[PDB]
RNA sequence: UUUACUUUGAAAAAAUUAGAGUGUUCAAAGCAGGCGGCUCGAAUAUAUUAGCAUGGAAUAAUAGAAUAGG
RNA sequence: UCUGGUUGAUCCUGCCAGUUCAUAUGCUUGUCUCAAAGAUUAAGCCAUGCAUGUCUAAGUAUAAGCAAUUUAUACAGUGAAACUGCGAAUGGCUCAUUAAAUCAGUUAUCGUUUAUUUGAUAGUUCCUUUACUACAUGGUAUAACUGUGGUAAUUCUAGAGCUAAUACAUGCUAAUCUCGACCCUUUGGAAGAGAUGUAUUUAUUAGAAAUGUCUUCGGACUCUUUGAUGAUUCAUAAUAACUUUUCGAAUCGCAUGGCCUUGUGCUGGCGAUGGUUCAUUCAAAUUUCUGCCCUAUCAACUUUCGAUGGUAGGAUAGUGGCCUACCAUGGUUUCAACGGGUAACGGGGAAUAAGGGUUCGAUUCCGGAGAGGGAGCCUGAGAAACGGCUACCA
């Protein structure tokens, strides 16, 4: 956890070292909303995670999206790839066509390529990454 | 551009307002105030399209900066003041009081009120939320703050607001079995009673509305205006009743 | 349009510089002060290599 | 989860109402009458039921005269696809329900709406949803058939005066082809 | 000269993208200020709107936290002893947030003493590294604020896990 | 079970297009109010795709602690 | 697309001949209504004139201005000049650049700034030099103006002398509220125990079987005690300090009412302009999803000099590789990435067509971008402004 110059912690969160009440540190966590529930692993997790939905300083809002996961091969990151058939009216036909989509993934989500991900909308976490998964399956 | 944009093409100009394609380049456009842009009537085109009193907007400045104009009980000089829905203009030397209410076309209506209806409006409740010193506070579709509201009162609710002193009289929750005014989309002007409220958390709700006729509609629940309860309005409506 | 010839390159120099620096960039691929301050042809030379290549023969 | 075990509040709802003025009355019940009729519009089968049998049981407590209203009701909130179906099963078990509690003559000011409901689902489009072999469903209340039995408890409470509206679409049918 | 715009880097497939308009003033940004311990020197800036914004060229004094004891008190600042970002920092003794520096002891051990009457007695038990600090004379805190936006140099005293890491990476 | 597909409803500025009324002297146009309650008057419509809400039994993909074992 | 030929007479396949829009131009051109004005891919260059200024009773007049007057005793009517304030960031024009960019529909700000409009909103009593301006502080000050001058020349200005403010810079003046013994039993009196703004920065904290008894039959006896969102470290409140630290009216017009212990005493009306925070409105900046013409004889591209992501910092109004330091090696691509062409601003729209389609859209509305070509800035709420400024090229 603390693998990083600078120390790891959730802000504004305060575990006094004098009245030792509990051995846990204090740690804080909310629900995203919309029925996704908080995976167990969140909160009794001991991961540090700013871009958490559930506990990070992130909210979800906007629209909520589905994926098939085609690349975890960098950190708390995921590329999903979303498929979609476009309409040419000129031949009545339709033809494939697929967008990938760069997702945060908090570490209290497991991945494998090629699960399928809920993910919902937060503000811009980095250059591209606009999104954070908030349901595995 | 570079900030904020002073003029309006006619052609640009809201529908509802009824102007001459022809008659000019350009049209009111209506200053910031109680109400939005495209869902207000500047004063000047009331006076002039609408009750003919003054005959070009030289002749609305002359009438404005005589005092005798009031909206909502004060005296408004400016020619584009953006007067709004509910709101009540009063001319005394004409002996007039008007509410400004839609008709079925989706038109603000000359609608004459009653002295004792002019000492009051409806204002559907927009925010509601504690400000400083922990001083509860609702919002209104006017932008009116009013302090120490009923605990009741929540969003969407109608409180009515006494002109004289800008306080709440009584108010209305929103309910089934209410009555409604449609203050958008294609169903603006239309007066019914609610039926459900479908909810969508995280999108729009809507709002299942039923006219006396027992015609069935469907709309955002932001358009929804609730004016009292069923067969007993608050306010005096205008002809038509909102049906059709 | 990018780089079409234009009327009057000259006066345009700045404008030129910059379309410069752009094909070098996007092409790169092939080939692998402060002004507000208070003080301020090839036929030819082929037939003499055959002719001259001729005499020595 | 709970949504089956809330549904009775609504028969509770009606009855301290019922105690209250006369123009509370009129102010609350239709309030309490109207939600009733929306939880109708859920696909859960079982939560169907609950709401059928609460409103059956507020159907006693009120009176024949509410039944134009709360048909009204179901009418709008009813229209389309299995909705209909909907709403021919309710009417019945509401009908039946109010059996005993419905006097001579009573049915007389719902008769018009409760024959177009019969009509349509009998001749109708719903009647031929109903004996469409395509039509694949578990839903009960399309594969069941109550326009018959709610036929006869019309007639048996129709005064012989209004009965000529039950006849009317008979004789229209019959003028079609058949 | 600086700007914050995203139109001049490459587009996410690797494309390079063209001038699509001039620079404007509202995706601006500013030279950074790179504060230094010193008497104290502070400059206004004008941002958007009428707001203004503190740079702290130079600062000598703050306001640190006793989280603990829940007290603030001004305190000297010595120096940078470390900063997670860069050394070059540490070694230049510039000012920013994050930055590990070390404190003038006084004023929290003369409150200590006035408070709890030491130099009860298990309310005054302290932890074990602070006390040593406190023999030391100075205190490692951690800067809270950000000298050049606000032109204040706060922070809090380390304490428990995260002085036990800074003391592991010092 | 989910998706595709299809129905319906919001949304998709005005101007432009189609349409209704109106003796601009006719027309191209412009235009919404008349009589002393009259049940008088634009009734209006229009947009392939994408997003939102909704009814669907077929079709095409997708699923099962399916008719399992002792 | 049709018509007539090619045979002694037909069918089929061929050949021959005739069969609106755009540009350029020729001739003619009386009356009514109405209406437009691009083009050398030359977004090439421009003489001259004009196109942005602005004053109410209500910021500042001893103009050596005018006119007045009961002929003036601080001023007072009107008012050049100048200071101050606001606007000049709107409008108008053009289509060069620009190919997931702009734009269209659809989203988010729980990711930020917002002059103005509209609605709310700020008694902090006291706290030693009281050695005390609040019946009201300074030049820490100047313009216009007077006078002496420089330059061929410009909306160039120097030295000296004056004088104001809603300019600039300072700075003050017996309150209210909790309980309440004791009397008295209400329209109660109150000995006394207590409490006391905002703004900035940081740390911490909060924000979740009384089914009885009596009573006059009413009522009283004990208890409750934040709100919102799908969702927050939200709204809000509290503690301890912090600050080159703010704000909390030294402003203006009209009028002269009410109390008296008769004082130029005390009090007092209707307005203007300001001012802290919040909400609203007019906006702005970013932002989710889907949708662009030709090219594969462009198959690999991005990554050394940020490309994809992580941690921290800086910068910003704010998110974010936007930038920096250290880390990993990622990201796009035959479902066409990347590169190239475009006589490519995008759309609403226009034409044609029976329908599918094809073409046009600089051009009356919306959005973008530019002001000969690059670059950077001052002021301001708002500009990377060009009828603002500074440099370089022509
Ligand atoms: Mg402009
Ligand atoms: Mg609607
Ligand atoms: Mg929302
Ligand atoms: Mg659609
Ligand atoms: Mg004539
Ligand atoms: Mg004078
Ligand atoms: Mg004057
Ligand atoms: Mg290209
Ligand atoms: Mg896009
Ligand atoms: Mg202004
Ligand atoms: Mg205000
Ligand atoms: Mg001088
Ligand atoms: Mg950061
Ligand atoms: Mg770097
Ligand atoms: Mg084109
Ligand atoms: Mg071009
Ligand atoms: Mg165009
Ligand atoms: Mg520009
Ligand atoms: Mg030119
Ligand atoms: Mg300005
Ligand atoms: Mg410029
Ligand atoms: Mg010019
Ligand atoms: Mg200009």
Redesign the interface.
């Known amino acids: 956890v603390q693998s990083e110059r600078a120390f790891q912690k959730q802000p504004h969160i305060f575990n006094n070292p004098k009245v030792k009440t509990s051995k846990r540190t204090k740690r804080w966590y909310k629900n995203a909303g919309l029925g996704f529930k908080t995976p167990k692993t969140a909160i009794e997790g001991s991961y540090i995670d700013k871009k958490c939905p559930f506990t990070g300083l992130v909210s979800i809002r906007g629209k909520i999206l589905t994926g098939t996961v085609v690349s975890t091969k960098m950190h708390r990151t995921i590329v999903i790839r979303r498929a979609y058939l476009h309409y040419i009216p000129k031949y009545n036909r339709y033809e494939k066509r697929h967008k990938n989509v760069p997702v945060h993934v908090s570490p209290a989500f497991r991945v494998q390529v090629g699960d399928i991900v809920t993910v919902g909308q937060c503000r811009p976490i980095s250059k591209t990454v606009r999104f954070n998964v908030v349901k595995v399956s | 551009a570079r900030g904020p944009k002073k003029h309006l093409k006619r052609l640009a100009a809201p529908h509802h307002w009824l102007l001459d394609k022809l008659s000019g380049c350009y049209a009111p456009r209506p200053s910031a105030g109680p109400h939005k842009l495209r869902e207000s009537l500047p004063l000047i085109v009331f006076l002039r399209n609408r009750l003919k009193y003054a005959l070009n907007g030289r002749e609305v400045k002359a009438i404005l900066m005589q005092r005798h104009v009031k909206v909502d009980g004060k005296v408004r000089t400016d020619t584009t003041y953006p007067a709004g829905f509910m709101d009540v203009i009063t001319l005394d030397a004409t002996n007039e009081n008007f509410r400004l209410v839609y008709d079925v076309k989706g038109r603000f209506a000359v609608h004459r009120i009653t002295d004792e209806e002019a000492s009051y409006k409806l204002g559907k409740v927009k925010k509601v939320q504690l400000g400083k010193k922990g001083v509860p506070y609702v919002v209104t579709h006017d932008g009116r703050t009013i302090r120490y509201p009923d605990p009741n009162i929540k969003v969407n609710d109608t409180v009515k607001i006494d002109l004289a002193s800008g306080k709440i009289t009584d108010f209305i929750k929103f309910d089934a079995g209410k009555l409604v005014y449609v203050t958008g989309g294609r169903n603006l002007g239309r007066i019914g009673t609610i039926v459900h409220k479908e909810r969508h958390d995280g999108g729009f709700d809507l709002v299942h509305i039923k006219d006396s006729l027992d015609n069935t509609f469907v709309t955002r629940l932001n358009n929804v205006f609730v004016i009292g309860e069923q067969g007993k309005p608050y306010i005096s409506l205008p002809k038509g009743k909102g049906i059709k | 349009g990018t780089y079409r010839k234009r009327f009057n390159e000259k006066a345009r120099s700045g404008h030129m510089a910059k379309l410069k620096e752009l094909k070098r960039i996007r092409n790169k691929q092939f080939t692998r002060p402060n002004a507000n301050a208070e003080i301020l042809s090839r036929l030819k030379k082929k037939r003499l290599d055959k002719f001259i290549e001729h005499q020595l023969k | 989860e709970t949504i089956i075990e809330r549904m009775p509040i609504a028969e509770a709802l009606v009855n301290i109402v019922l105690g209250l003025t006369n123009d509370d009355i009129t102010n609350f019940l239709p309030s309490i009458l109207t939600n009733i009729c929306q939880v109708l519009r859920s696909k859960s089968e079982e939560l169907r039921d609950a709401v059928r049998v609460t409103l059956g049981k507020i159907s006693i407590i009120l009176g024949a005269e509410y039944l134009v209203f709360v048909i009204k009701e179901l009418m709008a909130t009813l229209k389309r696809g299995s909705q209909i179906h909907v709403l021919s099963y309710t009417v019945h078990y509401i009908l039946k329900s109010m059996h005993g509690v419905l006097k001579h003559s009573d049915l007389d000011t719902s008769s018009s709406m409760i024959v177009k409901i019969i009509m349509e689902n009998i001749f109708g489009f719903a009647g031929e949803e109903k004996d469409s072999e395509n039509y694949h469903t578990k839903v009960k209340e399309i594969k069941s058939n109550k326009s018959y039995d709610a036929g006869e408890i019309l007639a048996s409470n129709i005064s012989l005066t209004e009965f000529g509206t039950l006849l009317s679409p008979v004789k229209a049918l019959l003028m079609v082809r058949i | 000269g600086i700007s914050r715009d995203?139109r001049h880097?490459r587009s996410?497939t690797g494309a390079?993208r063209?001038?699509f308009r001039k620079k404007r003033k509202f995706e601006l940004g500013r030279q950074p200020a790179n504060t230094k311990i010193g008497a104290k020197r502070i400059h206004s800036v004008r941002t958007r709107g009428g707001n203004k914004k503190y740079r702290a060229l130079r600062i000598e004094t703050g306001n640190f936290s006793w989280?603990?004891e829940g007290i603030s008190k001004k305190t000297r600042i010595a120096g940078v002893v470390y900063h997670?970002?860069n050394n070059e920092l540490v070694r230049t003794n510039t000012l920013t947030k994050?930055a590990i520096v070390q404190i003038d002891a006084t004023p929290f051990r003369q409150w200590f003493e006035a408070h709890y009457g030491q130099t009860r007695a298990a309310?005054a038990?302290?932890?074990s590294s602070v006390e040593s600090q406190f023999s030391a004379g100075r205190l490692y805190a951690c800067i809270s604020s950000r000298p050049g936006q606000s032109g204040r140099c706060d922070g809090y005293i380390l304490?428990?896990?995260?002085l036990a890491?800074?003391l592991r990476?010092l």
């Open positions: 995203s880097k996410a390079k063209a001038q989280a603990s997670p970002s994050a309310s038990k302290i932890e304490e428990g896990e995260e890491f800074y990476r």
